[PDB]
Design a protein around this ligand. Structure first.
Ligand SMILES: Cc1ccc(C(C)(C)C)cc1S(=O)(=O)Nc1ccccc1C(=O)O
Ligand SMILES: Cc1ccc(C(C)(C)C)cc1S(=O)(=O)Nc1ccccc1C(=O)O
Ligand SMILES: Cc1ccc(C(C)(C)C)cc1S(=O)(=O)Nc1ccccc1C(=O)O
Ligand SMILES: N[C@@H](CCC(=O)N[C@@H](CS)C(=O)NCC(=O)O)C(=O)O
Ligand SMILES: N[C@@H](CCC(=O)N[C@@H](CS)C(=O)NCC(=O)O)C(=O)O
Lengths: 226, 220
């Protein structure tokens, strides 16, 4: 019954969500670095493990998970059994699942589109206003989700907050949260959590890498700093 | 308990996955059509319900689900407790979940990218070779997933097959499966399912609407 193995590159927001859960729950996990900027995700053995050539990838015994949201759910069920991060009551759990899928299908997709365009085209050649519209629309949606509750999926911290805060912090490197009071209040609260320390290093490394590869600077005024 | 309400436009592959499960499980639902090509997902009451302005959206009592994969899991858990579609064993369930997320993050994302490019740019201006690459890569991955099993997540049909097949068939409007023996056999087998009837109307409607909006004709 070996301990979980996490193939990771901390610059990835989804990776940082798993790192946050691992810290929060004090899970002993072996970390194996896969440098996405060097193309190590295309190494023959890693491609054999995960044809999607993506991180995070978790190997836990015979189970191989290739999506951060399955990893969060699996680790919560194995190490937060009966807990509130992945709540027990069906309706509450479905709400968390719904927000995890929002992060996958909407927030991360749009941030990935924007950041991938910077890498492929160079910042100066990206239609920044187009991506500002796409990502501001995500801000609007999250502000709507927090108008009803202090956390994304209810009155208390869940996997949904861990998944969303890492990508939110990455989007906020570029786009300010000035017009989004509930989102700012939530993001500030998330930054006070001990587990949020697992987000800081990879976010800074991503900032450095993006500014280098994209030949630009994020506006220092955008990022919320607590 | 009030019956579930499904807001839908059957051109949507993820909508069609939910329609297939509803047929598979004989679920009594109220369907409410939201015409995506008239922008009805932006009607004030629907945005109020789903800020993502997306279908499928399920309202089941007080629970509002805004993603097909949550809808599939929810409906399987209410209406198919003890079935093989959403297996009870943890390892098997995680495998199904992992494949559902592949459909969302990889297969559907790339098909959505391609279809979106048609609408934004016009078919005649789409870099078809680029999207043929991204999507053939998805075919390659699914062919590998099928190495050991008859179905995407194992020896039996699961929610993962329902989610993947609808998007597959949409990709297959443009890109054939002749070079993927496992994938083609799997798709043919899926097409024999009684529940696959739920995919037929929306797939044909999507082709027809895409061809007017794209001002082209799919090679199929
Ligand atoms: C952003 C990005 C672009 C391109 C790459 C390659 C080197 C693989 C081409 C890697 C990354 S990344 O390592 O920084 N990861 C992400 C981080 C934030 C948002 C999206 C992504 C993403 O990969 O889609
Ligand atoms: C409420 C409940 C009761 C019993 C079960 C078992 C069949 C495991 C006994 C599972 C659940 S559940 O609603 O809490 N389950 C998930 C939802 C989404 C994604 C994964 C799961 C999961 O069960 O792993
Ligand atoms: C019916 C319709 C109307 C309007 C839209 C826009 C949002 C593009 C204006 C999309 C659709 S659609 O339901 O046909 N859309 C997809 C179909 C197949 C694969 C992916 C998609 C997708 O929307 O990403
Ligand atoms: N939905 C997936 C997204 C995984 C993903 O796209 N990871 C990126 C980094 S953020 C990656 O590994 N890219 C490597 C590649 O695509 O080649 C998840 O939540 O894990
Ligand atoms: N991951 C989501 C994707 C939902 C989605 O993107 N639906 C499309 C149709 S395929 C839609 O409703 N588009 C309308 C819009 O975004 O305005 C799911 O599986 O439900």
């Amino acid at each position: 019954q070996p301990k979980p193995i996490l193939y990771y590159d901390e610059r990835s927001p989804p990776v940082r969500s798993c790192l946050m859960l691992i810290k929060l729950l004090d899970i002993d996990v072996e970390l194996r670095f896969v440098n996405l900027f060097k193309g190590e995700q295309f190494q023959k053995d890693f491609l054999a493990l995960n044809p999607q050539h993506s991180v995070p990838t978790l190997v836990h015994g015979d189970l191989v998970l290739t999506d951060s949201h399955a990893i969060l759910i699996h680790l919560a069920e194995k190490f937060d059994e009966g807990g509130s991060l992945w709540p027990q009551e069906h309706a509450e759990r479905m709400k968390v699942l719904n927000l995890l899928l929002f992060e996958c299908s909407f927030l991360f997709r749009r941030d990935s589109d924007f950041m991938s365009a910077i890498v492929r085209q160079g910042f100066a050649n990206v239609d920044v206003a187009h991506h500002e519209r796409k990502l501001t629309e995500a801000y609007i949606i999250m502000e709507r989700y927090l108008e009803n509750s202090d956390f994304m999926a209810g009155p208390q911290l869940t996997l949904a907050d861990l998944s969303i805060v890492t990508t939110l912090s990455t989007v906020n490197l570029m786009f300010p949260l000035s017009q989004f009071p509930r989102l700012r209040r939530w993001f500030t609260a998330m930054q006070q959590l001990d587990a949020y320390e697992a987000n800081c290093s990879g976010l800074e490394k991503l900032r450095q890498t993006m500014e280098s590869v994209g030949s630009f600077q994020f506006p220092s005024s955008s990022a919320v700093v607590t």
